Amino acid sequence: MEMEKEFEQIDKSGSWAAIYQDIRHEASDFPSRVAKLPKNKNRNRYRDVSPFDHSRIKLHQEDNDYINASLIKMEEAQRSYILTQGPLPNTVGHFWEMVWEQKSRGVVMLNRVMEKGSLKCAQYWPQKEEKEMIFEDTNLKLTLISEDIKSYYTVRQLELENLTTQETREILHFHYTTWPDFGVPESPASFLNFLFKVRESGSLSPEHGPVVVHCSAGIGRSGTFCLADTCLLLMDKRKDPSSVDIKKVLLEMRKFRMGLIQTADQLRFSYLAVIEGAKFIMG
Ligand SMILES: Nc1cc(Cl)ccc1Nc1ccncc1
Secondary structure (H helix, E strand, C coil): CCHHHHHHHHHHHCCHHHHHHHHHHHCCCCCCCCCCCHHHHHHCCCCCCCCCHHHEEECCCCCCCEEEEEEEEECCCCEEEEEECCCCCCCHHHHHHHHHHCCECEEEECCCCEECCEECCCCCCCCCCCCCEEECCCCEEEEEEEEEECCCEEEEEEEEEECCCCEEEEEEEEEECCCCCCCCCCCCHHHHHHHHHHHHCCCCCCCCECEEEECCCCCCHHHHHHHHHHHHHHHHHCCCHHHCCHHHHHHHHCCCCCCCCCCHHHHHHHHHHHHHHHHHHCC
């Protein structure tokens, strides 16, 4: 079926939970043996969220190459994304090592450091120009260059230096700051505006390594971001945009990381975002 009318048909019939459970039942199951080794327990935020072995990102280290991060490679859309958990106190250096080694231009953050009164990820970037951060375990330096605070999101320019080679690179930090502590946003308008700002920066384009995107577990909000982006790109590329099947795209993405889209409300919000986004692209 088309998307907008399949949408109204699920609303009128109130069957979002049943649709979402079908997706959970059909989703791929692949091994995640490296994630579950005992030496990696303190590298995982949640015991039930792990990268598959076949798609995990490897750190360029001979001691321990493990990080909780997955490469989502969308062949028809010609887009790749790295989805990862919010960094832990003991994995902030690994996180920036990955950004460096994978040649990423941008980092997309979809959570606040504290939500619901608890810490959802480490404070992993500097908040003042004159107070830079040094990660001694991975030999990297990170400096805040500039910050632009808007009503729904903040964009930061950062300098990452590899202290071993003295090479430097400019990294863009796109921070969506207004996702509610509970539920999903009422309108997709600010989320779509944010996605378009990331696109306009070049961070999603083939001349760079994959964008790094995270929330707290790296599957819920993060899944919503890449699902919406890929579906809108496919609608632009195909002769028949109504052929794009968001459930099929989500199941394809779940071949590369488990659990993408965590609730039926996030599924409905993803449909809403793609539907509204497809009108603005054209009007
Ligand atoms: N809207 C639309 C519908 C059909 Cl059937 C064919 C072409 C368009 N136009 C497009 C196509 C691809 N990308 C943008 C616009």
